[PDB]
Amino acid sequence: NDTVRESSFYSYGTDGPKYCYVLYNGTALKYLGTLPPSVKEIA
Amino acid sequence: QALSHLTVQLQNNFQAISSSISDIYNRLDPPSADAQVDRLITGRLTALN
Amino acid sequence: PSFYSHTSVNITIDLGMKLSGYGQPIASALSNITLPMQDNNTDVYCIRSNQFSVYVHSTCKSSLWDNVFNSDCTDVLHATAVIKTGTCPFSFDKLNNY
């Protein structure tokens, strides 16, 4: 629910924008963006 | 079919890096860009003929 | 969307010039190219950030038919380093064009 800095971890660890990341060793490696409201399938 | 073929002929590279003139001018210096664009010009003229 | 991380790549080109017997400036093949230091070396540089920019810094020196560059280039022997496309599908000056 909050932006995570590069090579960092979530600070506070429900309703609002969600920022998605790829984690390798508990640290943010790639930023994927916000979750769009119209996701219908993930392959 | 004739119009369809004429329209689809615009995707031919004609031995160039790209079929988009804007991409060529955004990726290359003008001296090389002109040489790249000349091939597309010739191919499109042949298709029109 | 992506992370923001910018890297500047400075390429240093040291040129050697001389005067030929016909009165024309000749650029020596002993000119040196220096890349930013990476992994304890300065000959290969790979981009490891999301965004990058490229810059060229040129220096000029002169010798007298002895490959001993110890004097600054004069008005006749002054030269500037440039990078041309060659065989690449893109030019160096267009690398900063997204």
Ligand SMILES: *[C@@H]1O[C@H](CO)[C@@H](O[C@@H]2O[C@H](CO)[C@@H](O)[C@H](O)[C@H]2NC(C)=O)[C@H](O)[C@H]1NC(C)=O
């Ligand atoms: C490019 O670098 C080379 C060395 O890699 C320089 O050649 C040396 O020059 C010094 C004096 O600056 C001499 O004492 C050495 O004997 C030279 N070494 C060799 C192997 O020739 C060269 O001068 C540099 N070129 C320019 C234009 O700066």
Ligand SMILES: CCCCCC/C=C\CCCCCCCC(=O)O
């Ligand atoms: C749920 C875990 C993975 C989430 C990944 C989210 C990252 C990027 C999403 C990009 C936008 C997708 C848009 C799909 C098209 C549409 O909006 O209909």
Ligand SMILES: *[C@@H]1O[C@H](CO)[C@@H](O)[C@H](O)[C@H]1NC(C)=O
């Ligand atoms: C995200 O959730 C945590 C835990 O409830 C909360 O402390 C924080 O304020 C939230 N952040 C935002 C931007 O809403």
Ligand SMILES: *[C@@H]1O[C@H](CO)[C@@H](O)[C@H](O)[C@H]1NC(C)=O
């Ligand atoms: C992962 O991070 C931990 C600290 O959170 C560190 O001790 C460990 O060495 C890291 N592992 C790798 C494989 O880098």
Ligand SMILES: *[C@@H]1O[C@H](CO)[C@@H](O)[C@H](O)[C@H]1NC(C)=O
């Ligand atoms: C490259 O040179 C510029 C000035 O031209 C300087 O500000 C910058 O820090 C240099 N980059 C590196 C990585 O040293």
Ligand SMILES: *[C@@H]1O[C@H](CO)[C@@H](O)[C@H](O)[C@H]1NC(C)=O
């Ligand atoms: C790089 O070289 C330095 C000395 O210049 C040395 O201390 C260091 O260990 C080297 N790095 C390596 C081997 O990863």
